[PDB]
A paper describes a structure:
Here we report the biochemical characterization of the [name] enzyme encoded by the genome of the ascomycete Trichoderma reesei (TrAA12). The three-dimensional structure of TrAA12 reveals important similarities with bacterial soluble glucose dehydrogenases (sGDH). TrAA12 preferentially oxidizes l-fucose, and weak activity was measured against d-arabinose (11.6% relative activity), d-galactose (5.7%), l-arabinose (2.8%), and d-lyxose (2.2%). Based on these results, the [name] family of enzymes is likely to have a catalytic mechanism close to that of bacterial sGDH.
The three structures superimposed very well, and no major differences in the main chains were observed. All the structures solved present a constitutive calcium. The calcium ion presents a typical octahedral coordination. Three amino acids are directly involved in the coordination: Glu259 and Gln301 with their side chains and Tyr276 by the main chain. Three water molecules complete the coordination, stabilized mainly by the side chains of Glu238 and Asn26. Of the seven predicted N-glycosylation sites, five are visible in the density maps on Asn94, Asn147, Asn184, Asn306, and Asn341.
Residue numbers in the entry: 28 to 200, 205 to 430
Write the structure that this text describes.
């Protein structure tokens, strides 16, 4: 019904994939989720939670017919989730995770129903607070929280609550203190993207790793350290959960080329930071810290991860590099997963990310490129995603 077009060289779809721009003019759209009524809720950062009414003509033929601001709150900056029954919306500021009653008869939120479920999350620099509600354990809410600086010493202290993911049984609800949740992982500089694999309920996160990396004082920031895919075990069990994934004393290797003191290190292995606390060595990184399951190209900046219904594929948004001479990212990629809920690629792979939508000319980014942020599936397996810098929502599907 509406003719919406991109204002930059359009994304390139891999063979077998098609897409359509369905919404424009949003302020800075981040997390997105469908409600029970087929409306798309958008966390529009600096505005609040917006609901988009869609007409669906099938395939990529969707049009926005109306938009409404459900929750007006300029402090909401990224995180959004909705209960499986559709009656509770969760959204986060830098400091607080709020729960609101959502009236799906009227598609309204009464602001007086707001309650704080998690608090004390405030810190500088990395200010997003991703929310994930478990499907396998529907009363479990995961909350991710990044570092206070590029290299944050408080991330060494687990009680600070910096650079870690926590889980809360919201059925047991004054709000939880952040560090009162179950520890899913710490030493996670800024793992904005957190998802659950339906094959087995495995918890996965994607990492925005350190900027300005040095190795024996040599600048190796152009191609290191890699971005990471981290595994946190099964929700409710302790196996492969609650460890320290290395920030800020250990980083993962992406590019071996010209890397000082490589030794026995391979792609995917973690090595000690030049600025690691006194006494930490490469060996400490091997024995005491948890390595990533897979690494990606340095600085692609992943922001969300969503699995399809079968659990055969995860989709990841690469929001794009900001400080690399030639830009990288600005894409949507897929990673293949096996029957045991783990990636089919080995941990030393440099080719695990398969291109779904890419920018045609990375030299133009980020000014003339989309910057994917949030993903969500609808009930029939179409993928929807936000581009915050461009104020856009897209639909994506196999043709
Ligand atoms: C949401 O709906 C409002 C109201 O229809 C839209 O605001 C209009 O935007 C158009 C340009 O697209 C203007 O020409 C109109 O004057 C605006 N109307 C009003 C009353 O403000 C808004 O653009 C829509 N936004 C989204 C994201 O759908
Ligand atoms: C790690 O972080 C925790 C955060 O709780 C620090 O504990 C606080 O320390 C400040 C300053 O010493 C005190 O004013 C608070 O009373 C402490 N809070 C608690 C819960 O006791 C701790 O000092 C930091 N250092 C560590 C523990 O290594
Ligand atoms: C280790 O910490 C030092 C902190 O000094 C970092 O070195 C800084 O790197 C930038 C280059 O991007 C220089 O402009 C600064 O001048 C350097 N030191 C300062 C601020 O005086 C180094 O990047 C860190 N190495 C990492 C993160 O691997
Ligand atoms: C186990 C199984 O049914 N595998 C399917 C796969 O063939 C299909 O390509 C995919 C599409 O998302 O969904 C899943
Ligand atoms: C948040 O931290 C303060 C200490 O700074 C603590 O007293 C409070 O209990 C924490 N949050 C809640 C609501 O427990
Ligand atoms: Ca790590």
């Amino acid at each position: 019904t509406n003719n919406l077009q991109v204002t930059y060289p359009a994304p390139v779809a891999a063979d077998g994939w098609e897409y359509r721009l369905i919404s424009t003019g949003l302020t800075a759209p981040r997390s997105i989720v469908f409600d029970s009524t087929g409306g798309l809720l958008v966390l529009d950062a600096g505005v609040g939670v917006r609901r988009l009414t869609l007409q669906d003509n099938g395939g990529t033929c969707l049009s926005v017919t109306a938009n409404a601001t459900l929750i007006a709150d300029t402090a909401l900056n990224h995180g959004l989730a909705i209960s499986a029954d559709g009656g509770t919306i969760y959204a986060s500021t830098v400091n607080d995770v709020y729960a609101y009653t959502y009236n799906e008869q009227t598609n309204t939120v009464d602001p007086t129903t707001r309650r704080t479920v998690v608090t004390n999350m405030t810190n500088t620099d990395h200010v997003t607070r991703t929310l994930l509600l478990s499907s396998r354990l529907p009363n479990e809410l995961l909350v991710s929280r990044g570092s206070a600086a590029n290299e944050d010493p408080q991330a060494r202290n687990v009680t600070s609550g910096h650079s870690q993911i926590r889980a809360y049984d919201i059925s047991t609800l004054p709000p939880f203190d952040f560090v009162a949740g179950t520890l899913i992982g710490w030493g996670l500089r800024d793992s904005v993207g957190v998802g659950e694999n339906p094959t087995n309920g495995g918890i996965w996160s994607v990492e925005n790793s350190v900027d300005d990396l040095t190795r024996e004082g040599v600048d190796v920031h152009q191609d290191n350290p890699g971005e990471e895919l981290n595994f946190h075990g099964i929700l409710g069990n302790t196996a492969n959960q609650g460890g320290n994934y290395g920030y800020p004393d250990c980083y993962a290797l992406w590019s071996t080329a010209g890397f000082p003191d490589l030794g026995a290190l391979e792609v995917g292995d973690q090595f000690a930071s030049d600025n690691a606390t006194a006494g930490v060595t490469d060996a400490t990184c091997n024995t005491n810290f948890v390595d990533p399951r897979l690494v990606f190209q340095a600085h692609v900046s992943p922001l969300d991860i969503k699995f399809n219904t079968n659990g055969t594929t995860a989709y990841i948004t690469f929001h794009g590099s900001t400080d690399r001479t030639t830009p990288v990212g600005y894409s949507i990629v897929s990673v293949a997963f096996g029957l045991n809920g783990q990636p089919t690629s080995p941990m030393d792979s440099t080719t695990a990310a398969n291109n779904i939508l890419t920018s045609p000319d990375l030299t133009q980014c980020p000014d003339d490129c989309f910057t994917p942020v949030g993903l969500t599936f609808d009930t029939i397996g179409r993928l929807f995603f936000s581009s915050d810098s461009t104020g856009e929502i897209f639909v994506l599907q196999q043709s």
